[PDB]
Design a binder for this molecule. Structure first.
Ligand SMILES: CC(=O)N[C@H]1[C@@H](Oc2ccccc2[N+](=O)O)O[C@H](CO)[C@H](O)[C@@H]1O[C@@H]1O[C@H](CO)[C@H](O)[C@H](O)[C@H]1O
Ligand SMILES: Nc1ccn([C@@H]2O[C@H](COP(=O)(O)O)[C@@H](O)[C@H]2O)c(=O)n1
Length: 273
């Protein structure tokens, strides 16, 4: 249905560059229904981190959906709203003294990532979080309201969700990872591995080894939201790349994708300081 915002990200024939890349049939979250991967997609995904002798994926996903919800709506019930407005907050130190907190919090969803804190940074980054993307090597404890979106880069990452909410047996991947987390099982969502390959193939055109968490978060919000505003992406005005509180990816090519999306009004970018 056409959205009721000023513009709608889904709208075709605004930009053929967007229409070529956006695929409305993509499902960005894993469910029991959608979890079968095509062989080529599965082989691509195993190659990202090259784990030795991974456990069978369908067995892992079965066990995963004994623990966390296995029948989420893949677009997080976007069907029940007419205009969903989202803020996607990256980690750039361009948010320092930006005073973007209130405008960030004014959105329906606020999506954060990795170990980025809000505590003590609220005036700049906001206090609201509806969804927060993590992987085992870049988790921090989340407030209890917050949906955790696990972005899996290897079979162990799904195993880790199982373990860290239950037995606490996985404490190491390529680095130490938390053996337990406090996040409630009902608040966990799983980014679909096929949607990672869609991001890589169609949005990044095969640039990088695989997509960064920032660009995965952006394309995910193109699908789940009608209006998307980006904060904390890019360097600051002095050209520094640092975090606001403290190769594998092609950051130039990903940056250019977000610049082009902004130019066609499919997102807005707040550049900060
Ligand atoms: C910097 C880099 O290439 N990181 C890769 C690498 O990481 C390591 C491997 C072995 C020991 C230490 C590290 N490490 O702490 O940097 O290889 C792993 C796979 O074994 C990852 O691909 C690292 O890349 C990170 O992956 C995460 C997702 O796990 C995320 O994409 C980060 O953006 C990326 O740097
Ligand atoms: N200086 C920065 C810092 C982070 N970022 C974005 O925020 C996302 C998460 O940052 P971290 O991986 O450093 O936690 C990155 O993958 C990137 O797209 C950015 O675009 N500019």
């Amino acid at each position: 249905r056409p959205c009721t915002c000023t513009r709608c990200i889904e709208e075709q024939r605004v930009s053929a560059w967007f229409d070529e890349r956006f695929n409305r049939s993509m499902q960005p979250l894993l469910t029991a229904k959608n979890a079968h991967l095509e062989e080529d997609t599965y082989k691509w995904w195993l190659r990202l981190q090259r784990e030795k002798q991974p456990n069978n994926l369908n067995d892992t996903i079965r066990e995963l959906f004994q623990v966390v919800p296995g029948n989420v709506d893949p677009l997080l019930e976007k069907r029940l709203v007419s205009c969903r407005r989202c803020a996607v907050v990256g980690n750039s130190g361009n948010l320092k003294e930006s005073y973007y907190g209130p405008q960030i919090d004014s959105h329906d969803f606020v999506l954060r990532m990795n170990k980025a804190p809000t505590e003590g940074f609220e005036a700049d980054v906001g206090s609201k979080t509806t969804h927060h993307f993590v992987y085992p090597e870049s988790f921090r404890e989340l407030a209890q309201e917050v949906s955790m979106i696990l972005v899996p880069f290897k079979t162990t990452d799904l195993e880790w969700v199982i373990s860290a909410t239950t037995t606490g047996r996985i404490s190491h991947t390529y680095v130490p990872v938390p053996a337990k987390i406090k996040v409630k099982k009902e608040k966990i969502l799983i980014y679909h591995p096929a949607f990672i390959k869609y991001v890589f193939d169609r949005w990044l055109q095969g640039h990088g080894r695989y997509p960064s968490t920032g660009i995965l978060s952006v394309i995910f919000s193109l699908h789940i939201c009608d209006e998307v505003d980006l904060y904390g992406f890019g360097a600051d005005s002095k050209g520094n790349w640092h975090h606001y509180w403290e190769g594998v990816h092609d950051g130039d090519f990903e940056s250019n994708v977000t610049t082009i999306l902004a130019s066609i009004n499919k997102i807005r970018i707040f550049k900060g300081r």
